[PDB]
Design a protein around this ligand. Structure first.
Ligand SMILES: [Mg+2]
Ligand SMILES: [Zn+2]
Ligand SMILES: [Zn+2]
Length: 1259
DNA sequence: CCGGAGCGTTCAGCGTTCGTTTATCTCCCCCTGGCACTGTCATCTCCGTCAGACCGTCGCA
DNA sequence: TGCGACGGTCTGACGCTCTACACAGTGCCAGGGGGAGATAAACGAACGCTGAACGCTCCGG
């Protein structure tokens, strides 16, 4: 389990694994249903089908286990041994493996210098091959064979001359006799014409016999190894004419005979020689050939296994034939493929037994080879073997691949026991850490524990009686159930589970109904909505699992979302509206009892219950001792003649009753919050509470906030009648004026003075102006009292666009294929659309639905790719010895006379760590190795700093992984990241979580294609794939003079760098936009055409820091366009995992291949060991590569096998004979060992616990 | 005042009879072998992916 | 050889579950070797049968 090897399995290994020969094709008997002898499903080879029974019906008893039956040879043992015992099929003629031959040429490898079409010709029995030639023996006796050929030519010419003389005599004789007989007037001309026709035909066959002799001579003269011969007649006449000189064969046996004598070390030698000198695509050919051949040199596995003689068989359980109801049978397609191979092998053996024609034997060997190929890969070549006539049979590989393969459907993700699922309901009566399971769910989940406690409580005599009562379901079972499930957490989980908070451990609690009762305060972190969403409940089982549920997983410890550090367990739908109504100012609502002193909040509550004081009214309310005053009230303390402090003393405040209640919700140590709460300030309050109070106190305060928010939202005066939604009264006249001027334009267009396109453009412009103006009128119309504004201005639920298109006009709405109708929807949803206006609304609606479906699909795909590329990076050191960092800006866009901090400081500089101390006047403002929060950043920007050096992960160098300090504080705990936290998966999920939340598509292309770059999720995936964007913006290599060259066929730009640097020319199309000055000043910074720069050349000509900044800035500017906030360290992790590979050149002294994928640490180690040897180091360039290519090119082939290309990497590992170290997480999920992240580390599992001496002395 | 016949238990003679095997006689099964006018090249997939690579191929320059 | 483009090749293409299902057109008989399965006999052992025999308490003239 330390190491998991792979390689080519030669026939010796197959025979070692095998336990017999599957000689016969049949599987089971047709009446007794017993497995056959020495055939498929054989009990002698694979093992018995029952337990400790044998085939011949004897030896049914268990006592004499491990013996061999004399009658039938079946070993008596368990029935599960048929899951692990394999045999083999002995093939009469060798066949090739379809994985290596007929694949990617990087894995075919050109090990023999043959074209793939030549292989198709040779091993599919359509063209011959010469396997061996006695070249030195052929060249030794050249004068003798030349003399024999000369003798043959001489006798050919002699017999031609004799035949010519005889034909001349015959022609003269017949001409003389037909001119002397005089049978006809011109019969001599006819016989002469016939004679000359005979002349030309016999001369033709003479030149033809000469031609075949010449062609066989020049064919034999240039015969060598690796020679093919398509024509069977030509090879036959070489065999007949010339003997024991060249050896050839037919089919895959030719490859075996070539490979047994194939000399490959000198092949690598001369191939290195042609690597050293040459030019062109020959370099690439020899490069791939040397990268494949050198695998067989260093490794000890012989290359014999590419062509095979034996075929191992799957054990019979894994290709079962199971009995069903009604007598029907169901078998796997592997049994059918094995049956086909066995039938054809038996028929080939039968043909080899007797004397058979070569065409029939060759066709039999071809169909055998094709059947073996179909067994290894059904559908790789040609029409797949269908079978029933509907679908192709699934081969071995066809279930090692894809969504139906073992890697992705049964190894990474598995079904589980002790799990349950039902719909969800909201329960406000629960705490933060409680969930309500039904009775049936809790009984079926906790059934074995219930039986154990029932036997312990002796309600049942033994286990069977306990099970009988549980199945019957008596009330004592429910009582002991309620006694059991407490102090036993369960894992709740939603199916999408987009991010880390999709699994949260609650404490179960018995409730009635058939639905899981769930705290509303946490349902937004699940993305849960109570509309039939079904949540599965998984049960942690051992002590370790429920301990990790209690400590790591509890719902009262997951306040802060790891995506941005913002609180996520304070939802907004209903409680925020209640607190808004509780704490808002009295505007538009009649304030009763406005401006009267109150002794305490109790007297105010009594007055409010009486009815003479409204909830929001500016009153002077005195507060008892211990209440902390507001942040703004401490300096404006009540004026004092003697020295006094208002910090712990009583005070009077000008605040409403509702704010006093709200500060009764918050803890006593919190300062009196004295403003409109809404949502954003509530998020800030919850963030401050989480940052400055322990977890249990924060859970209690949010539970109080939930309860009071619901209580006051019931009485908040929100409701939606149709009078509450109000249309602007000015909308009628605004629309009337705009349609009047539209009518004026329409009669203006009717005269043809303007085109249709210009009219459409100006019409959509003026109608956009109209909808913006009526939106402004709508904002100016509504008061603060109506509930729609009260639930949209409080951050509760809704945006201003929705209220704009319910009250005001719906505005402009798109057509099919992304254009705009000149006529907008002038009717509001309160007024109600007309027929066709509603039709054009449906145009946009269905496109939006299809867009969000495809968007969530591609978001899941990007999330998976990010998880693969960004995994196996884990915090593994406490601190580095480094001091280098990143120059992240802190103060930007300062005005005249003032300094302003950066706008995106909250996602970039926050939650990081300083690389070194900062000084402005010789004194440190912020110490090194501390987090950067609000107060410290405010102090720095007040002192007058412009940029800071943050110790980020891109500059982190370490012996293994990354350290905690260089990564920065974790955004999910609010503290420093613990050693072992799997930061890579958290980063990948945080990038992939708002993929469905982007909801972006290009509104209009402007009538031209290609002018607009990719937007939204396609832009993000194009950035992370390191691909060249669709809008390419070239960058000048050096500063110099740049001018345009407007060639008519294709535009052209030319930049001439100064200082004697070489001219570089960039090709640009005849497209509309180019922003560079002709004969103007240019440098490396700017871009010749506005567009997305290709980041490959950015890295090439600017540096690693510049390309890191560019990538981070681009993805963050995509994400910030929608409102989703992702911290930049999550991107920086993927970018660091992205630039790790380095491309090397001129590696003539570093003794490895130049111009491939080389790891950075390995390249540095090679440089160190070659400068230790004295040789000059090889050059190297960093290579920005995509997430997919970096995921495939990994050390552990199990992780790459679990990814997309699972056939290429398996063949690659088999050829390279690479064994993977099990450092990683996919390769530890598959095996079932503990993952090396978090609790699974070595430094945590190696603890020994013992009580102290005074502890055992006490008891 | 010990004798006797009757009664309880305990083993060896021969006499049949179960306990356990064997080859013989119907019945069915199963694999190989046999058909003697002539009748000598079928079969129908596969389209409104799909997106952009990734690649070697391959003819033109 | 460098060029494009033409081409084949190849891969996935968010997620469980309330739900969930099954699947079709062209020969025939005789002769012969195995093995299960019924028949009656047969080798071997013990299971009954013959009362007889060892030996006591026994009512007894
Ligand atoms: Mg839902
Ligand atoms: Zn047996
Ligand atoms: Zn570090």
């Amino acid at each position: 389990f330390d190491e998991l090897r792979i390689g080519l399995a030669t026939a010796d290994d197959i025979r070692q694994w095998s336990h017999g020969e599957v000689k016969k094709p049949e599987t089971i008997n047709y009446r007794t249903l017993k497995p056959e002898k020495d055939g498929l499903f054989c009990e002698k080879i694979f093992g018995p089908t029952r337990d400790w029974e044998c085939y011949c019906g004897k030896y049914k008893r268990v006592r004499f286990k491990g013996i061999i039956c004399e009658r039938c040879g079946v070993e008596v043992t368990r029935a599960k041994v048929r899951r692990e015992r394999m045999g083999h099929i002995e093939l009469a003629a060798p066949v090739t493996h379809i994985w290596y031959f007929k694949g990617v040429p990087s894995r075919l490898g050109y090990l023999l210098d043959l074209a793939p079409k030549d292989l198709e010709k040779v091993i599919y029995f359509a063209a011959y091959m010469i396997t061996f030639v006695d070249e030195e023996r052929r060249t030794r006796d050249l004068p003798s064979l030349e003399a024999h050929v000369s003798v043959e030519r001489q006798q050919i010419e002699q017999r031609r001359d004799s035949d010519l003389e005889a034909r001349a005599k015959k022609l003269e004789t017949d001409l003389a006799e037909l001119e002397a007989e005089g049978a006809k007037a011109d019969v001599r001309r006819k016989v002469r014409e016939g004679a000359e026709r005979e002349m030309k035909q016999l001369r033709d066959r003479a030149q033809r016999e000469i031609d075949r002799l010449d062609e066989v001579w020049n064919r034999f003269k240039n015969l060598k190894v690796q020679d093919l011969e398509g024509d069977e007649l030509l090879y036959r006449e070489l065999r007949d004419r010339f003997g024991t000189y060249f050896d050839g064969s037919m089919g895959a046996a030719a490859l075996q005979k070539r490979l047994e004598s194939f000399d490959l070390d000198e092949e690598a030698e001369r191939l290195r020689e042609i690597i050293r000198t040459g030019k062109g695509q020959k370099k690439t050919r020899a490069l791939k050939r040397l990268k494949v051949v050198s695998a067989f040199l260093q490794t000890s596995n012989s290359p014999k296994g590419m062509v095979l003689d034996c075929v191992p068989v799957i054990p019979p359980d894994l290709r079962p034939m199971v009995q069903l109801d009604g007598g029907r049978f169901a078998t796997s397609d592997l049994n059918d493929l094995y049956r086909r191979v066995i039938n054809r092998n038996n028929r080939l053996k039968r043909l080899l037994d007797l004397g058979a024609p070569e065409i029939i034997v060759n066709n039999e060997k071809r169909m055998l080879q094709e059947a073996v190929d179909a067994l290894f890969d059904n559908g790789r070549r040609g029409r797949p073997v269908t079978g029933p006539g509907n679908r192709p049979l699934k081969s071995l590989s066809d279930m090692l691949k894809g969504k139906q393969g073992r890697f992705r459907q049964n190894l990474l993700g598995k079904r589980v026991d002790y799990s349950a699922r039902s719909v969800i309901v909201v329960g406000p009566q629960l705490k933060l850490h409680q969930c309500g399971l039904p009775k049936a769910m809790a009984l079926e989940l906790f059934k074995p524990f219930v039986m154990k406690r029932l036997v312990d409580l002796n309600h049942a005599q033994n286990i069977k009686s306990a099970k009988r009562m549980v199945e019957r379901g008596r009330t004592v079972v429910y009582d002991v159930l309620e006694e059991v499930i407490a102090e036993h957490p369960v894992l709740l989980n939603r199916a999408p589970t987009l991010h880390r908070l999709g699994i949260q451990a609650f404490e179960p609690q018995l409730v009635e109904g058939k639905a899981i009762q769930i705290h509303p305060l946490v349902c937004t972190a699940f993305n849960a909505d109570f509309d039939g969403d079904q949540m599965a409940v998984h049960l942690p089982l051992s002590a370790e699992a429920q301990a990790e549920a209690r400590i790591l997983m509890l719902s009262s410890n997951n306040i802060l979302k790891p995506a941005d550090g913002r609180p996520v367990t304070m939802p907004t739908q209903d409680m925020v509206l209640g607190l808004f109504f509780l704490t808002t100012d009295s505007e538009g609502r009649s304030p009763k009892g406005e401006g009267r002193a109150f002794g305490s909040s109790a007297e105010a509550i009594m007055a409010f219950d009486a009815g003479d004081l409204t909830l929001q009214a500016k009153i002077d309310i005195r507060f008892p001792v211990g209440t902390i005053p507001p942040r703004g009230f401490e300096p404006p303390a009540r004026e004092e003649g003697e020295p006094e402090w208002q910090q712990g003393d009583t005070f009077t405040l000008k605040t409403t009753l509702g704010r006093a209640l709200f500060n009764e919700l918050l803890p006593e140590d919190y300062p009196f919050v004295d403003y409109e709460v809404g949502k954003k300030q509530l998020s800030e309050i919850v963030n401050d509470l989480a940052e400055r109070y322990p977890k249990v106190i924060v859970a209690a305060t949010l539970d109080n906030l939930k309860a009071a928010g619901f209580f006051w939202a019931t009485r908040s005066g929100v409701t939606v009648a149709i009078s509450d939604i109000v249309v602007p009264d000015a909308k009628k006249e605004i629309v009337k004026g705009y349609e009047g001027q539209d009518e004026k334009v329409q009669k203006q267009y009717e005269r043809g003075l303007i085109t249709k396109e210009e009219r459409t453009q100006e019409l959509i412009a003026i109608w956009t102006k109209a909808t913006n103006e009526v939106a402004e009128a709508m904002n100016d119309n509504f008061p603060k009292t109506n509930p729609v504004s009260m639930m949209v201005n409080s951050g509760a639920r809704g945006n201003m666009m929705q209220m704009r298109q319910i009250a005001g006009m719906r505005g402009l709405v798109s057509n099919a294929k992304n254009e705009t109708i000149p006529r907008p929807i002038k009717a509001s949803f309160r007024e109600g659309l007309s027929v066709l206006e509603y039709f054009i609304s449906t145009h946009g609606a269905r496109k939006g639905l299809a867009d969000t479906a495809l968007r969530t699909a591609d978001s899941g795909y990007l999330t998976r790719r990010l998880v693969d590329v960004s995994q196996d990076v884990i915090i593994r050191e406490e601190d580095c010895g480094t001091e280098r960092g990143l120059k992240l800006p802190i103060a930007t866009r300062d005005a005249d006379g003032t300094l302003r901090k950066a706008e995106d400081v909250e996602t970039s500089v926050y939650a990081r760590m300083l690389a070194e101390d900062v000084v402005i006047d010789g004194k440190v403002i912020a110490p090194a190795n501390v987090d950067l929060g609000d107060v410290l950043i405010d102090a720095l920007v007040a002192h007058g700093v412009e940029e800071v050096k943050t110790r980020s992960i891109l500059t982190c160098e370490s012996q293994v992984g990354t350290c905690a300090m260089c990564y920065g504080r974790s955004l999910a705990t609010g503290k420093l990241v613990d050693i072992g936290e799997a930061v890579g998966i958290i980063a990948a999920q945080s990038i992939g979580e708002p993929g469905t939340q982007l909801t972006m598509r290009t509104f209009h292309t402007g009538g031209v294609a290609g002018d607009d770059i990719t937007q939204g999720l396609p832009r993000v995936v194009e950035l992370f794939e390191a691909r060249t964007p669709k809008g390419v913006a070239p960058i000048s290599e050096a500063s110099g003079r740049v001018r345009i060259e407007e060639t008519e066929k294709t535009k052209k730009i030319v930049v001439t760098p100064d200082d004697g640097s070489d001219e570089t020319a960039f090709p640009i199309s005849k497209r509309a936009r180019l922003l560079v000055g002709e004969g103007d000043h240019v440098e490396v910074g700017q871009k010749l055409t506005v567009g997305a720069t290709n980041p490959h050349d950015v890295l090439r000509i600017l540096g690693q820091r510049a390309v890191q900044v560019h990538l981070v800035g681009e993805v963050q500017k995509v994400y910030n366009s929608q409102g989703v906030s992702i911290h930049d360290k999550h991107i920086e992790i993927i970018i660091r995992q992205m630039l790790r590979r380095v491309t090397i050149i001129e590696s003539g002294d570093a003794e490895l291949l130049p111009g491939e994928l080389v790891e950075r640490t390995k390249f540095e180690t090679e440089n160190r060991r070659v400068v230790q040897e004295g040789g000059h180091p090889a050059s190297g360039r960093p290579q920005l590569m995509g997430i997919t290519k970096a995921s495939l090119a990994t050390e552990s082939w199990l992780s790459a096998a679990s990814f997309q290309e699972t056939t290429r990497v398996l063949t690659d590992a088999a050829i390279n004979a690479k064994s993977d170290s099990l450092i990683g997480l996919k390769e530890n999920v598959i095996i079932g060992k503990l993952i090396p992240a978090g609790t699974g580390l070595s430094r945590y599992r190696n603890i020994r616990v013992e009580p102290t001496e005074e502890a055992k002395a006490a008891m």
